[PDB]
Coordinates of C-alpha atoms and ligand atoms in Angstrom, one line a residue:
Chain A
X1 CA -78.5 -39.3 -87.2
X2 CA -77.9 -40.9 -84.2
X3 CA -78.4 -44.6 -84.2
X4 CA -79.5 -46.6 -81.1
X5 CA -79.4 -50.3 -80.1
X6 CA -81.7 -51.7 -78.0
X7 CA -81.8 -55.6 -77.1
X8 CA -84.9 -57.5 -76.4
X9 CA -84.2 -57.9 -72.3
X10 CA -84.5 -54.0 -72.0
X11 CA -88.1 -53.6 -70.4
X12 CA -90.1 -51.5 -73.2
X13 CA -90.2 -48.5 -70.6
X14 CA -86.7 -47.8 -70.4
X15 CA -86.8 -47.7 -74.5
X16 CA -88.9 -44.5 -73.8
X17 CA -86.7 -43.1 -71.2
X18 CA -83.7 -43.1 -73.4
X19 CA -85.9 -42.0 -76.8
X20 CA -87.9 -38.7 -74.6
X21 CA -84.4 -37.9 -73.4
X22 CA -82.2 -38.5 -76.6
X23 CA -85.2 -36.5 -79.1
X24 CA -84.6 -33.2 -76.4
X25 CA -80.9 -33.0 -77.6
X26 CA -80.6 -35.4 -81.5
X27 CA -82.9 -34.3 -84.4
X28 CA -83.0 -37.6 -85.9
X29 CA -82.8 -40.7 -83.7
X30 CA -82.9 -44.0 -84.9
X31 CA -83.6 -47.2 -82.6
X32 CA -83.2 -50.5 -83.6
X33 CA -84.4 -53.7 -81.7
X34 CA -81.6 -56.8 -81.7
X35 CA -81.7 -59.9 -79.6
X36 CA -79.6 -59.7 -76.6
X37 CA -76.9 -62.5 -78.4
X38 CA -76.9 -60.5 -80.9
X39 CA -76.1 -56.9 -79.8
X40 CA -72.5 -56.7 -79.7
X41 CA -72.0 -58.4 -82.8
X42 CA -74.0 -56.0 -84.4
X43 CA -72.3 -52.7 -82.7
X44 CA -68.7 -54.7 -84.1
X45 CA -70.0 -54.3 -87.7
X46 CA -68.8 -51.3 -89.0
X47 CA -70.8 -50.5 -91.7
X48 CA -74.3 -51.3 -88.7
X49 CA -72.5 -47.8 -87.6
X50 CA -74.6 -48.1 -83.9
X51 CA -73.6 -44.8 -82.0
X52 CA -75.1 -46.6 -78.6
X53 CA -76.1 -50.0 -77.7
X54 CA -78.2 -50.8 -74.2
X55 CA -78.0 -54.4 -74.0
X56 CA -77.2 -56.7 -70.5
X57 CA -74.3 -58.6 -72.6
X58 CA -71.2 -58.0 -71.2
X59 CA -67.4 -57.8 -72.7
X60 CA -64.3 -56.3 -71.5
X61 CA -63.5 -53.4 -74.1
X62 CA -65.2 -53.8 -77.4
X63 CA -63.1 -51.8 -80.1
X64 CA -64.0 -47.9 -80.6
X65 CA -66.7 -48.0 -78.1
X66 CA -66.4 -47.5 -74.1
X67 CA -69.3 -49.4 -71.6
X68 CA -71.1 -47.6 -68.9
X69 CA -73.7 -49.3 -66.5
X70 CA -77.2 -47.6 -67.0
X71 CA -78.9 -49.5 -64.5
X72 CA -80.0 -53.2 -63.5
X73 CA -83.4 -55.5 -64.7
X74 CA -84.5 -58.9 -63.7
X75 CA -84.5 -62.1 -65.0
X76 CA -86.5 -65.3 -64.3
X77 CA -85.7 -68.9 -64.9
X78 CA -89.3 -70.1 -65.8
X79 CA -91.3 -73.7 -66.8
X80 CA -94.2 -74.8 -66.9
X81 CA -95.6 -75.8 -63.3
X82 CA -96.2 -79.8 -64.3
X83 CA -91.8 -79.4 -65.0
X84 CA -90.0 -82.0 -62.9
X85 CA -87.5 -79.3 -62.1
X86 CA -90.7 -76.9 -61.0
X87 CA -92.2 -77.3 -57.2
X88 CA -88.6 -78.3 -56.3
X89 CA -85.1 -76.6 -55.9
X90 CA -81.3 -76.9 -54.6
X91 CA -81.4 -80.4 -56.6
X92 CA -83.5 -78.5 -59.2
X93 CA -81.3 -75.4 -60.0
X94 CA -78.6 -78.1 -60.2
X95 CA -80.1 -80.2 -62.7
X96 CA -81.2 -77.2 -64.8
X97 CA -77.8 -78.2 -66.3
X98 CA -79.3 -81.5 -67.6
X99 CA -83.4 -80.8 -68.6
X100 CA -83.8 -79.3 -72.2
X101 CA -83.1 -75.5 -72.0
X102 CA -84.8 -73.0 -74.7
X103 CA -81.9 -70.9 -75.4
X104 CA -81.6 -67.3 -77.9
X105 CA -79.7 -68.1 -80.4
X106 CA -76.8 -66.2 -82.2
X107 CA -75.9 -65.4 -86.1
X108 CA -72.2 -65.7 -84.8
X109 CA -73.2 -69.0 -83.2
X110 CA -70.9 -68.0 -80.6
X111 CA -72.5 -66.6 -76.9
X112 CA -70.9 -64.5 -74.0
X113 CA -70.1 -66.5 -71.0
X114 CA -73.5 -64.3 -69.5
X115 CA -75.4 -65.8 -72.7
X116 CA -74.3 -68.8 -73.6
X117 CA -76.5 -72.0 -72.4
X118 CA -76.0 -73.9 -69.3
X119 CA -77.5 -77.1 -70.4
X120 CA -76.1 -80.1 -72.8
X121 CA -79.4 -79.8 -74.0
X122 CA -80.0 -76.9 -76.0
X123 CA -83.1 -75.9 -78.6
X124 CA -82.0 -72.6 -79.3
X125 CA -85.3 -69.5 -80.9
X126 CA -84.7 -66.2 -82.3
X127 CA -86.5 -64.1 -79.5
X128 CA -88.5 -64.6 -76.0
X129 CA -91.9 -65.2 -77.8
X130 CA -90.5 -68.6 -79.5
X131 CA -89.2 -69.3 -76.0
X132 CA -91.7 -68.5 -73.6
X133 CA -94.4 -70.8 -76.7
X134 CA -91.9 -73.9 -76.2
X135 CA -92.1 -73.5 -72.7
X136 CA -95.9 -73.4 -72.2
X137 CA -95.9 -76.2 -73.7
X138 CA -93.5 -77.9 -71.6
X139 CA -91.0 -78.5 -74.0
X140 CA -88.4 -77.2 -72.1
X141 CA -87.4 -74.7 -69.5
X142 CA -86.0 -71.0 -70.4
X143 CA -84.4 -67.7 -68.9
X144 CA -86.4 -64.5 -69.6
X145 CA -87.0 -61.0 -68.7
X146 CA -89.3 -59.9 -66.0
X147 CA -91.7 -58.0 -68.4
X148 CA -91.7 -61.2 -70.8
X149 CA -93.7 -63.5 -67.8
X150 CA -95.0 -60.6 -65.1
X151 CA -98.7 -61.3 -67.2
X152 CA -97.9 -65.4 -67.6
X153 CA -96.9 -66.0 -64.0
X154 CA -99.9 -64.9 -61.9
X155 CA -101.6 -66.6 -64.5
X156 CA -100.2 -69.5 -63.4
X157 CA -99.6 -70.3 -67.4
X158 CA -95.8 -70.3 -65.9
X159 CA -93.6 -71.1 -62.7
X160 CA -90.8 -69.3 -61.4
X161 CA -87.5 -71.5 -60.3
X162 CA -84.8 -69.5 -59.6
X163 CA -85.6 -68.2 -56.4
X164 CA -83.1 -70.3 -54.2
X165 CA -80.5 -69.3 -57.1
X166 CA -81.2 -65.8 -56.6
X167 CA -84.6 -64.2 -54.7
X168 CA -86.0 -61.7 -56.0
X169 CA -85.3 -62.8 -59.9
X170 CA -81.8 -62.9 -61.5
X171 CA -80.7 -59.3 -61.1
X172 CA -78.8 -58.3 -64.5
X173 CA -76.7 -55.0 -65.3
X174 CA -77.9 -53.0 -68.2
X175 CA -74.6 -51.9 -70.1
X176 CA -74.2 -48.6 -72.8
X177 CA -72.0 -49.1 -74.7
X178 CA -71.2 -45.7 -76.6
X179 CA -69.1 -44.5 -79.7
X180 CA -65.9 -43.4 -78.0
X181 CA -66.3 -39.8 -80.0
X182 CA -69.5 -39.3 -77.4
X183 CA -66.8 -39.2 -75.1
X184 CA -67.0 -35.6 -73.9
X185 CA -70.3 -34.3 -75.4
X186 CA -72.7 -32.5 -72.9
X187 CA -75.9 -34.2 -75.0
X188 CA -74.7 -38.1 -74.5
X189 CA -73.9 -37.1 -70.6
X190 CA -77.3 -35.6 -70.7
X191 CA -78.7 -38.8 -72.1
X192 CA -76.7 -41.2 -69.3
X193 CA -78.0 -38.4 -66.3
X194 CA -81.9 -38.3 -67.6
X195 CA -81.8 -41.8 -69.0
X196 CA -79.9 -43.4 -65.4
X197 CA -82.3 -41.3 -62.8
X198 CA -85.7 -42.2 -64.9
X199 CA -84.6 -45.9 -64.6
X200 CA -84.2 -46.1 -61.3
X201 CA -88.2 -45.2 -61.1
X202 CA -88.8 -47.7 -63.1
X203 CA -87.4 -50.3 -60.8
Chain B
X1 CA -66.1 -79.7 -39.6
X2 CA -68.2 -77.4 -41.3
X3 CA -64.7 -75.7 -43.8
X4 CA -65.9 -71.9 -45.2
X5 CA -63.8 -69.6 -47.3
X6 CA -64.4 -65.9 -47.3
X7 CA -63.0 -63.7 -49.6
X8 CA -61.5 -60.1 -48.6
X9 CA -64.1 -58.5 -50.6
X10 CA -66.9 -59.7 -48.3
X11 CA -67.7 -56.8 -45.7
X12 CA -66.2 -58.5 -42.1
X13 CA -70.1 -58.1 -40.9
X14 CA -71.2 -60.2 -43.4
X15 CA -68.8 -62.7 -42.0
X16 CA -70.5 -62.4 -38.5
X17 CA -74.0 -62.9 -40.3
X18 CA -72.4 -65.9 -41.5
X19 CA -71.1 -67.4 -38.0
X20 CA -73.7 -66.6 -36.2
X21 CA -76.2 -68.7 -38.3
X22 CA -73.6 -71.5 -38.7
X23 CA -72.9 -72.3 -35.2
X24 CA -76.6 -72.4 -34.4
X25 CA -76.9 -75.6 -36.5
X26 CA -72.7 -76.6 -36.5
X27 CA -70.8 -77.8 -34.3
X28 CA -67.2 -76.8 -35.5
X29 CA -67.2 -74.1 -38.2
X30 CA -63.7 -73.4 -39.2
X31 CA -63.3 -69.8 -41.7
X32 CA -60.7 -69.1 -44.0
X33 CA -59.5 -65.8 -45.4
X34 CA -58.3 -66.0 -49.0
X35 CA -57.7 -63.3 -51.9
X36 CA -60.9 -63.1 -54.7
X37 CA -58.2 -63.5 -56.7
X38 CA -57.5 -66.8 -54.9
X39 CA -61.1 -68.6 -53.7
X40 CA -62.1 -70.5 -56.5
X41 CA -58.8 -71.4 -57.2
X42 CA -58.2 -72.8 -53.2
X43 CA -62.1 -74.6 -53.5
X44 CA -60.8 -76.4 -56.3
X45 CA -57.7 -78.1 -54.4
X46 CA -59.5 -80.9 -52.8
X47 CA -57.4 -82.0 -50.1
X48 CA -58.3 -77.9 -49.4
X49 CA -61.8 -79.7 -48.6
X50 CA -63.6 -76.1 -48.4
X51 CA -67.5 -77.0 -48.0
X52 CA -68.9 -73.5 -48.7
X53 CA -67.0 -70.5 -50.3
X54 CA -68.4 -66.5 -50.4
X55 CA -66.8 -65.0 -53.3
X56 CA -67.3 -62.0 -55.9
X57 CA -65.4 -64.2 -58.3
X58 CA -67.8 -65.8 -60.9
X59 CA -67.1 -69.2 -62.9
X60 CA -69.8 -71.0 -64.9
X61 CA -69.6 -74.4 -62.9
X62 CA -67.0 -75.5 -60.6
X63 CA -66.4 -79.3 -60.5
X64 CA -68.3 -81.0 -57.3
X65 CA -69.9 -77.4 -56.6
X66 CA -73.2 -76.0 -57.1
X67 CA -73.5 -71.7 -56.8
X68 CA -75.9 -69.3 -55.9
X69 CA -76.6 -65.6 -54.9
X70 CA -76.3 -64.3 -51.6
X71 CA -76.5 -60.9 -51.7
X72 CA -74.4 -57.5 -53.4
X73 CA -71.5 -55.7 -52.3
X74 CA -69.9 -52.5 -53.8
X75 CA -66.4 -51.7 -55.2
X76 CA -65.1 -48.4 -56.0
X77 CA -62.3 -47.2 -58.4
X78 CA -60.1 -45.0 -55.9
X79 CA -56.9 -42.9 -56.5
X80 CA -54.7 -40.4 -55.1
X81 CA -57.4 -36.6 -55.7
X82 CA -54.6 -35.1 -57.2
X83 CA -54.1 -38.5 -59.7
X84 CA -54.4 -37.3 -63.6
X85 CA -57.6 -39.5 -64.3
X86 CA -59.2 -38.0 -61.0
X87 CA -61.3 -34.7 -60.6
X88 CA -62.5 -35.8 -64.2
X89 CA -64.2 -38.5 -66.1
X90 CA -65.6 -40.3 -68.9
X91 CA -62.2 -39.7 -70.7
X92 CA -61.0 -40.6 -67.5
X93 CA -62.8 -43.9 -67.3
X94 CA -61.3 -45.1 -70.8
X95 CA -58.2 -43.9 -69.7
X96 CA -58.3 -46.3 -66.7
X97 CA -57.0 -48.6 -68.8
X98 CA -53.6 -47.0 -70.4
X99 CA -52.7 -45.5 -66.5
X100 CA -51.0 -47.8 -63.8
X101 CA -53.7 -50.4 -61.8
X102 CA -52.3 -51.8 -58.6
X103 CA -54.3 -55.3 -58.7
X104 CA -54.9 -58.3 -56.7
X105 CA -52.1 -61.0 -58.1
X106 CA -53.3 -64.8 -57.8
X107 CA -51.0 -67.8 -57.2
X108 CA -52.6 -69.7 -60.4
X109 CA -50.9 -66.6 -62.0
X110 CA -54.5 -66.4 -64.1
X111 CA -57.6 -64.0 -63.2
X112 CA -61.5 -64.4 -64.0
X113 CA -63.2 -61.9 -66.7
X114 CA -64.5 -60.4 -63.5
X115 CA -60.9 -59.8 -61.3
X116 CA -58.1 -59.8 -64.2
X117 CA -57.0 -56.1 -64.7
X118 CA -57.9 -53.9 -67.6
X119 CA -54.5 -51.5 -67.7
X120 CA -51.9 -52.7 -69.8
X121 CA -49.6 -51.1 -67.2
X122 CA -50.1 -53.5 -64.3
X123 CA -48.6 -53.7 -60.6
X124 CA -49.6 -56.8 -58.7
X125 CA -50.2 -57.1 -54.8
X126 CA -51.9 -59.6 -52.3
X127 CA -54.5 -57.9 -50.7
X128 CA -56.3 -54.8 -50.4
X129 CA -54.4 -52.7 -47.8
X130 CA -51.3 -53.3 -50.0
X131 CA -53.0 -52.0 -52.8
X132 CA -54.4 -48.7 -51.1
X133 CA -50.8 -48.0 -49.5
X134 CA -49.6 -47.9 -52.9
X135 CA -52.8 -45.9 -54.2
X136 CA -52.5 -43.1 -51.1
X137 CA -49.3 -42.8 -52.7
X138 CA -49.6 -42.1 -56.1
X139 CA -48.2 -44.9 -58.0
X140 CA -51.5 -45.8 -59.7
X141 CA -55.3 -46.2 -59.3
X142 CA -57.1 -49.5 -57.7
X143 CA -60.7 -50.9 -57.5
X144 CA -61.4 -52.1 -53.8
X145 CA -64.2 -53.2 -51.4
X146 CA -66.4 -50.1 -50.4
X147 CA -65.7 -50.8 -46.3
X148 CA -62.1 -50.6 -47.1
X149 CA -62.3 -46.9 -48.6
X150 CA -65.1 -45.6 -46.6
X151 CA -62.5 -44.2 -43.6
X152 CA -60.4 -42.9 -46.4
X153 CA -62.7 -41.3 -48.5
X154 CA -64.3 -39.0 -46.0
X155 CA -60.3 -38.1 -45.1
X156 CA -59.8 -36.8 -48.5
X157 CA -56.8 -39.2 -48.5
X158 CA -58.6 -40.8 -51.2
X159 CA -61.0 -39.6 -54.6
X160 CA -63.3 -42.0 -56.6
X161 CA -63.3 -42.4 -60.1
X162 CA -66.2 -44.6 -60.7
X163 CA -69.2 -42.9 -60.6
X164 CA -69.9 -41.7 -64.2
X165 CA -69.1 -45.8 -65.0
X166 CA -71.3 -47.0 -62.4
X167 CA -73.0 -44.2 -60.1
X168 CA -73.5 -45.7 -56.1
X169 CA -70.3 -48.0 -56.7
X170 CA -69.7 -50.9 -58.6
X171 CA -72.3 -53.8 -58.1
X172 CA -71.2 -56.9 -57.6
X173 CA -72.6 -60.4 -56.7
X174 CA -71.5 -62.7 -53.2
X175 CA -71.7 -66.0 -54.7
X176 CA -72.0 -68.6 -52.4
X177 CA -70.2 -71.9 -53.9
X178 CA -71.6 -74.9 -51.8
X179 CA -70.5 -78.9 -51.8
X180 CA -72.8 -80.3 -54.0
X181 CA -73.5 -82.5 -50.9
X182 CA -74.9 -80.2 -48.8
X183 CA -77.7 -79.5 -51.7
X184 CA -80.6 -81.2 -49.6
X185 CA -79.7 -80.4 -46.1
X186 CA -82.3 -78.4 -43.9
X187 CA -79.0 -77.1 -42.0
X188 CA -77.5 -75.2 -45.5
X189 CA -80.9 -74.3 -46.4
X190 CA -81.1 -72.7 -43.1
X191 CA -78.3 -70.7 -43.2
X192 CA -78.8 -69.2 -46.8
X193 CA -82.3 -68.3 -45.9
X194 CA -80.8 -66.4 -42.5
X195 CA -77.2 -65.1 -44.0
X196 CA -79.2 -63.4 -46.9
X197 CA -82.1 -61.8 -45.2
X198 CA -79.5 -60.5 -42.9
X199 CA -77.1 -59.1 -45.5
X200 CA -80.0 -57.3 -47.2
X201 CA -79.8 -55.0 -44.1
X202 CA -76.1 -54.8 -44.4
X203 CA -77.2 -53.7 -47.6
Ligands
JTI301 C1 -77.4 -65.3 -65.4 O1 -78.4 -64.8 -66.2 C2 -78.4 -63.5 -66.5 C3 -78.1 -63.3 -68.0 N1 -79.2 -63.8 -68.8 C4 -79.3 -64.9 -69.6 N2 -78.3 -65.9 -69.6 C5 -78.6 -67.2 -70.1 C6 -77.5 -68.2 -69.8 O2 -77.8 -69.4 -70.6 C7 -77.4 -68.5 -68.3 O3 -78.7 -68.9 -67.8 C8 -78.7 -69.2 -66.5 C9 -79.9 -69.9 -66.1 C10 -80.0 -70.3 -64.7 C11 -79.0 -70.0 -63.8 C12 -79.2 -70.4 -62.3 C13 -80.5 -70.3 -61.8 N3 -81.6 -70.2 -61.4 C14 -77.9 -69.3 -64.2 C15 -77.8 -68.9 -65.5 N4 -80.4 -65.0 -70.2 C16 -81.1 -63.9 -69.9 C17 -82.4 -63.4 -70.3 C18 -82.8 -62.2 -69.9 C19 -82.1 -61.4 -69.0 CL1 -82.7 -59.9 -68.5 C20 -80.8 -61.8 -68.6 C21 -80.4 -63.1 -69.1
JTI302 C1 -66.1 -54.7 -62.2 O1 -65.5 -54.8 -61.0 C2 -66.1 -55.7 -60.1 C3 -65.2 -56.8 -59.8 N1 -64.1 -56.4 -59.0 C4 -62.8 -56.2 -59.4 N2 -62.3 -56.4 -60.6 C5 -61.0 -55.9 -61.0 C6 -60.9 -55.9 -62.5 O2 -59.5 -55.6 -62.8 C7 -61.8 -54.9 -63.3 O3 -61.7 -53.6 -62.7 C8 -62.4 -52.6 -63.3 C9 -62.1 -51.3 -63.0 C10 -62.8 -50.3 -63.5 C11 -63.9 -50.5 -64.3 C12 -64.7 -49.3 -64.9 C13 -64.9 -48.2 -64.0 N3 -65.0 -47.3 -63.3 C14 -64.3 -51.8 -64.6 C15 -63.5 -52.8 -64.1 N4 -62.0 -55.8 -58.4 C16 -62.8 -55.8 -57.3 C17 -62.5 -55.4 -55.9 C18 -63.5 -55.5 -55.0 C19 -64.8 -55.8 -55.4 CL1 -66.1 -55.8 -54.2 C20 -65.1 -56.2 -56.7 C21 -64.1 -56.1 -57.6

C-alpha cells in the first residue's frame, strides 16, 4: 500500500496525473487530501506512514524523506472588488500587511515562513472554501490557488491584487517529498518522469 | 542619485535591461555589485542608502522596504564529471548533503533558508568564479547562476547534478526590494513595467 499526500493547492488535475501514473506500477494506492499547513506535519507523524507528499510547503530536509520539485502552480491574492486595497496597488500590496487577512490555519499552530500570514490581522479557516466565503463577503482579503477563483474572477464575484507583486499570479513550486527507501526504485522514478511531463501540459 | 544593488546571480543582461530603462527617467543611476549572500544584508545598512536592490535572496519584510517579483533566473548544481555524486542521481541528490559544498560566505557570517548551505562539510568563498575554480578542480560540488556554467558545460569541464531534483535548472525568483518611498512614483512604476517585460525575453 502506497500512501499519497496531496494538499489542497494542488490543482485537482495533477491529483489524476500522479493516481493514472502511480495505479500502472502500485496495486493499492491510497491518496489522502491535507491542507497545505498541514502537510508536513502530517508526513512527520510516524504512525500517518505517508510514502509521498505533493504539497507547495517548503523545508530544508525533513527526517527520512528527500524533496524533489514536480513542477510549479499559481496563486492569487484575491478581495472583493468594493476592498480599499482592490482597484489600487504599490501602496496596496504594502498595506496587505495591515487589512484583515483570511489565513489556513495549522493543528501545530505553527506555519512555514512560505505559509505563515503576513498581516497583524489574522482570521485563520480550515480550507479555501471558508476563505474564499469570508472574502465574498468582504470580511477580509486571502491568498488562494488559481483553480480556487479561475470560475469567481470572471464572475467578477472576486478581484485579483497581486499583479504588481507578481504578474501573472504568485508562481509556487510544487515539492515531493518521498520516503527516502523510494530512493532507487524504477516505479517512483517512473512516477516523477510521467507525473513531471503530464504537468507541464497542464500549465 | 538613483543607488541600485545587483546581486551576482542576476544574468549581466538583465543589468543592461535595467540601465537602460533607468536612465531614460534618471538622471544619475549609480549600480553596485554585491554577493546574494551579501544584498539584503548591505540594503539594510542605511548610511548604504541603496534605493532598489535585485536579489534571489528572499526575507519576509525588510524594514523601510517593500518587495516584489521581477522575473526568474536558473541555478544549477555543477561538479567536476568524474565527482562521486556525478554521472548518477537521486542517491546522489541526498548525498549532496554529506559531500563537500564550496558556498557563497557572507560578512553577517548568517545565510537565508534560501542561500545557507545544506552539506555539513562546508568550504566558504566570495563569489562565483571562486567557487567554480575550486569545483573544475575537484574539491567539492557548488550551485551557481546558469550564465556562469553555460561556457563550461558545453566544455565538458563541468557535469550537472540537478536535474532529477529540479529538471531545466533550479527556479528561482529576482526580487526587486524598493524604498518604500518610491512606492507611488510613475518613474519606478515605469521601470518595473519595462525591466520585467524585457527579462521575460531574457527568459
Ligand atoms: C507567496 O505565496 C506563495 C505561498 N502561498 C501562500 N502563502 C501565504 C502567506 O501568508 C504569504 O502570503 C502572501 C500574500 C501576499 C504577498 C504579496 C502579494 N501580492 C506575499 C505573500 N498561500 C498560498 C495559497 C495557495 C498557493 Cl498555490 C500558494 C500559497
Ligand atoms: C535552491 O537554490 C536556489 C537558491 N540558490 C542557492 N542556494 C544555495 C543553498 O546552499 C541551497 O543549495 C541547494 C543545492 C542543491 C539542492 C537540491 C538539488 N539538486 C537544493 C539547494 N545558491 C544559488 C546560486 C545561484 C542561484 Cl541563481 C540561486 C541559488
Amino acid at each position: 500500500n502506497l500512501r499519497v499526500l496531496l494538499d489542497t493547492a494542488i490543482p485537482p488535475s495533477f491529483c489524476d496525473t500522479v493516481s493514472s501514473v502511480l495505479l500502472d506500477d502500485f496495486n493499492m494506492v491510497s491518496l489522502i487530501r491535507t491542507s497545505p499547513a498541514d502537510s508536513l506535519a502530517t508526513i512527520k507523524q510516524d504512525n500517518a506512514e505517508i510514502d509521498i507528499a505533493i504539497t507547495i510547503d517548503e523545508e530544508l530536509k525533513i527526517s527520512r524523506f528527500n524533496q524533489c520539485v514536480l513542477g510549479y502552480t499559481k496563486a492569487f491574492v484575491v478581495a472583493h472588488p468594493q476592498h480599499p486595497l482592490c482597484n489600487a496597488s504599490l501602496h496596496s500590496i504594502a498595506s496587505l500587511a495591515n487589512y484583515r487577512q483570511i489565513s489556513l490555519g495549522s493543528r501545530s499552530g505553527q506555519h512555514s515562513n512560505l505559509l505563515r500570514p503576513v498581516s497583524d490581522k489574522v482570521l485563520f479557516v480550515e480550507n479555501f472554501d471558508d476563505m474564499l466565503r469570508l472574502v465574498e463577503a468582504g470580511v477580509g482579503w486571502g491568498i488562494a490557488p488559481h483553480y480556487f477563483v479561475e470560475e469567481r474572477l470572471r464572475n467578477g464575484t472576486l478581484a485579483v491584487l497581486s499583479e504588481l507583486y507578481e504578474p501573472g499570479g504568485i508562481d509556487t513550486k510544487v515539492y515531493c517529498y518521498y520516503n527516502t527507501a523510494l530512493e532507487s526504485e524504477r516505479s517512483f522514478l517512473r512516477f516523477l518522469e510521467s507525473a513531471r511531463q503530464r504537468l507541464r501540459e497542464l500549465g
